[PDB]
Amino acid sequence: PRRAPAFPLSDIKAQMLFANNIKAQQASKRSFKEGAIETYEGLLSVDPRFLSFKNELSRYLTDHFPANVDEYGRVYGNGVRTNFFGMRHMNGFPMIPATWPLASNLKKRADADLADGPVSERDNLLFRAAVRLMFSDLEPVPLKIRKGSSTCIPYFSNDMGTKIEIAERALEKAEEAGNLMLQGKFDDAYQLHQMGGAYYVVYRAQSTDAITLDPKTGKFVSKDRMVADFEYAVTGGEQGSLFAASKDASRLKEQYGIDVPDGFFCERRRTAMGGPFALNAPIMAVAQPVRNKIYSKYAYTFHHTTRLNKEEKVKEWSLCVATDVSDHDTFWPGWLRDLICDELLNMGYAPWWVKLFETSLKLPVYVGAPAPEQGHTLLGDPSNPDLEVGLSSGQGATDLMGTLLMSITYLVMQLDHTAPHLNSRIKDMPSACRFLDSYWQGHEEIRQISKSDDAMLGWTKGRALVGGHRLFEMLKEGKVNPSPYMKISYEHGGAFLGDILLYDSRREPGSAIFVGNINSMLNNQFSPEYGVQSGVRDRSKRKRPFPGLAWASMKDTYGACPIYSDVLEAIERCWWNAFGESYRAYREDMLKRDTLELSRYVASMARQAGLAELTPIDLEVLADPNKLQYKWTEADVSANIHEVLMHGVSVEKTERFLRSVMPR
Ligand SMILES: [Mn+2]
């Protein structure tokens, strides 16, 4: 077990991060957040007539529109793969209590029996190769940072200039400080450079849940959310328990007294964590160029834009295999850290910085108020941290890790069960070089698309495919997973970033095609996550700028879903059945007001010039900036609002900085 030390919230270390101000001390002292999101301004999540609108919506429509994914998990028909009832929650009120994150799933990795290192030593070499290349050619470019992004841990300053001082001083003595950590002087850099420190628990909120109608009596059973307690946590999955949080709304018919219409539970309380940036500066400064690298040197498996972007790569394929990933974060191996740091150093990457990683990569955490009468438990010991808490959200390069080991285990498994004889062209580390290059160049029969956990796969004429069918079959059975690092199933109802690949009768990659999910659109409408906090002059702080945009963008967006317009029918209809009015004109006017609001926000798009400057994708990024923090990469935005969203960082300081960090 070995508890990760449970220091009281009160601690000087707890202070050193925070600016010891308003939001700082408050966040230290923060109570459990709760509150209906103003799901539309002038419209919370709680309106009962709108709740009946959900009622008609998910009921009458799922009724009319049952899912069309086949046995293989490959998709046909309407292309629905999902209950519409995932709307049906307190989508402003979280399902409570909450999990307590572990410190070591290593035994949990020994339960899923996830491997402690290489399968074959060849595989080791493979690891070393992906590492070899992700740690290879570099063309540094100026770093950039979100405007209005709170410094979070440490100080929680909203000021950009804070982030400036932090990141720049980090550019100045990350060497000295990472050395201090190598010297073990964690708190010295942590209290002078204020580098590193801790994570702060926050929430992702699953907007939906797998509500399941009961034919025999109409029960609406959302998927249960098994979660750890503090003991299951500190005793790395050892003691403690795994358990659903209460889904009930009557507990707010209790507490809030709020009326409880059918099927309306409460959104899942997934938990991200914030953390110090000064080390994330080197992270973006390289990875973002590395992002650009693989997107340039390769893309292919890597480029992510239009469904077209992907589809074109796909229908090509004789065979295609959407992936399905178990708890994507927690499962990341620490021996993987071992090889990371290994070949970092082997390839001259800066040992102090390497120490900086391992610091962050096992950085101490903190729990706020997971339930009322819970948390405010400081965790870990920033003097000898040892956490194996899995992929903490504070890193942005975690995506690199996911995309990594996933692509690994994918391709590997393809060797394992489709192309072992072909491993013969993988004679060594250099062979792994030409190869991996070529595979991310795609000049291979076995194939993939990848983005963190989400991924797919591909195959062709040439002497390897039938085993692809086989491995396909086994995984489709899922009866045993060959993967010793992950529980990777096929996703029945598989998709890639909401690109729901469709199949026809032939069920082929060349058959039917991706669609932008329309149910997902419904989510965008009604089951997203955040409110805006309208009580601020600038929307830059606001979680969710301009929803009306998505309205207009809808065909341009998820009109990729064939049945699109019928969805329009249903929405407008059900709204006339709801508030008895024009959600049409409603949302139109919301769009108009979006243009109004943005109008003063924007200059070069002179007055209300029109929205022609913004890509429909960037339009998606403007109704939805938020996924840019966990979907869109930064460069994607057109430079205008890109800068409205982001601010530049000096190329030079970062340059020489990398020159230090890089083996030159
Ligand atoms: Mn998808």
Numbering used by the authors: 1 to 664
Provide the authors' original text about this structure.
Finally, we present the structure of the φ6 RNA-dependent RNA polymerase at 7.9-Å resolution, demonstrating that the structure can be determined for a symmetry-mismatched, globular 75-kDa enzyme inside a 15-MDa icosahedral viral particle. Localized reconstruction provided the in situ structure of the P2 polymerase to sub-nanometer resolution. The reconstruction was of sufficient quality to allow unambiguous fitting of the known atomic structure of P2 and to reveal possible P1–P2 interactions. The application of the localized reconstruction method to the polymerase complexes of φ6 exemplifies how this limitation can be circumvented, allowing the structure of a viral polymerase to be determined in situ. This opens up new possibilities for studying RNA replication and transcription in the context of the assembled double-stranded RNA virus capsids.
